[PDB]
Write a protein that binds this DNA or RNA. Structure first.
Ligand SMILES: [Mn+2]
Ligand SMILES: [Mn+2]
Ligand SMILES: [Mn+2]
Ligand SMILES: [Mn+2]
Ligand SMILES: [Mn+2]
Ligand SMILES: [Mn+2]
Ligand code: NA
Length: 325
DNA sequence: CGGCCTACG
DNA sequence: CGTAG
DNA sequence: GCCG
């Protein structure tokens, strides 16, 4: 088992969901307490189990696995021996964990904001609504549309949204293209949002595109919220006789950057953090959604595809459906 | 000891 | 701070 | 929390 998640395939369907879900509760709780390092270890340990070929049934099977030390192994041990881990159950049932989960799932609210509200005694969404002066415009939109945004986005919804985004993009710039990214590109059947990457084959033609696309969507009545090259939107998606709010991210990249943006926006989140860590720490190159930089030569790698980027980093290529770390 | 991804809005 | 994967 |  390689130590970095970008070095091994991770499929969408795997064999250790119970164990990985418990470790991911501890990771989320670590984040709520402000320990990104513990969050990362528990995330990495959960991800190792997703890459295993068979169910773990005995603690022996953890020996030598990266990111399993005393704490993560004890969690697995108790799950194998008893079906539950006391620590995980204590976190699950705690008022702090439940409220921090409730608040941070709001669009516009992160850990630091949620923690302040918790310390002020707030506990419910109705508590937040009663104090609207305490909210940014982004948070007001997240709270207003919270019920809809908690409804899984389906492929039906993705296909309808891709059509209206393609229509607006084509009206804004002939020849521009729209690519579905995010979890749906990795094969997920459901999601929390839909992510799209927009470019044009002639470098430079995409300048100014996103405001033009947004104007065109807003005048078709499709936009409930928006705030450039990244737009974090809430769309008014038509449904039979009605509509529902859906989170949509629109991203524009010049075609020279498109492979890097496609790679970054396809995820998973852990996969991409691990890939950037690998790039810098193992290969001495700096990776983001715009490019891959050699800081000694002061040059950017020219990539024509995601495959080119994996090759330049000395990694076996993984298709999107194996990036579900 | 001390890092842990690296951007944009 | 929030957002993104 | 784990590891370079
Ligand atoms: Mn026991
Ligand atoms: Mn997404
Ligand atoms: Mn840019
Ligand atoms: Mn998104
Ligand atoms: Mn230390
Ligand atoms: Mn994400
Ligand atoms: Na949030």
């Amino acid at each position: 088992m390689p130590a970095y998640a970008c070095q091994r395939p991770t499929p969408l369907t795997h064999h250790n969901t119970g164990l990985s879900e418990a470790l991911e509760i501890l990771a989320e709780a670590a984040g709520f307490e402000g320990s990104e390092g513990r969050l990362l270890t528990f995330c990495r340990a959960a991800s190792v189990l997703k890459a295993l070929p068979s169910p773990v049934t005995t603690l022996s099977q953890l020996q030598g696995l990266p990111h399993f030390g005393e704490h993560s192994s004890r969690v697995v041990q108790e799950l194998l021996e008893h079906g539950v881990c006391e620590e995980v159950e204590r976190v699950r049932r705690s008022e702090r964990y439940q409220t921090m989960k409730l608040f941070t799932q709001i669009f516009g609210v992160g850990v630091k904001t949620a923690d302040r509200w918790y310390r002020e005694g707030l506990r419910t969404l109705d508590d937040l609504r009663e104090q609207p002066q305490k909210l940014t415009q982004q948070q007001k939109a997240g709270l207003q549309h919270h019920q809809d945004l908690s409804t899984p986005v389906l492929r039906s919804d993705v296909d309808a949204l891709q059509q209206v985004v393609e229509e607006a993009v084509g009206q804004a710039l002939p020849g521009a293209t729209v690519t579905l990214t995010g979890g749906f590109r990795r094969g997920k059947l459901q999601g929390h949002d839909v992510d799209f990457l927009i470019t044009h084959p002639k470098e430079g033609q995409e300048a100014g595109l996103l405001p033009r696309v947004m104007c065109r969507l807003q005048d078709q009545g499709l936009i409930l919220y928006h705030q450039f090259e990244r737009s974090f939107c809430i769309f008014r998606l038509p449904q039979p006789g009605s509509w529902k709010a859906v989170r949509v991210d629109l991203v524009v990249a010049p075609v020279s950057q498109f492979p890097f943006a496609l790679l970054g926006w396809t995820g998973s989140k852990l996969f991409q953090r691990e890939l950037r860590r690998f790039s810098r720490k193992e290969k001495g190159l700096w990776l983001n959604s715009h490019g891959l930089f050699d800081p000694e030569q002061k040059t950017f790698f020219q990539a024509a595809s995601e495959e080119d980027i994996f090759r330049h980093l000395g990694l076996e290529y993984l298709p999107p459906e194996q990036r579900n770390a």
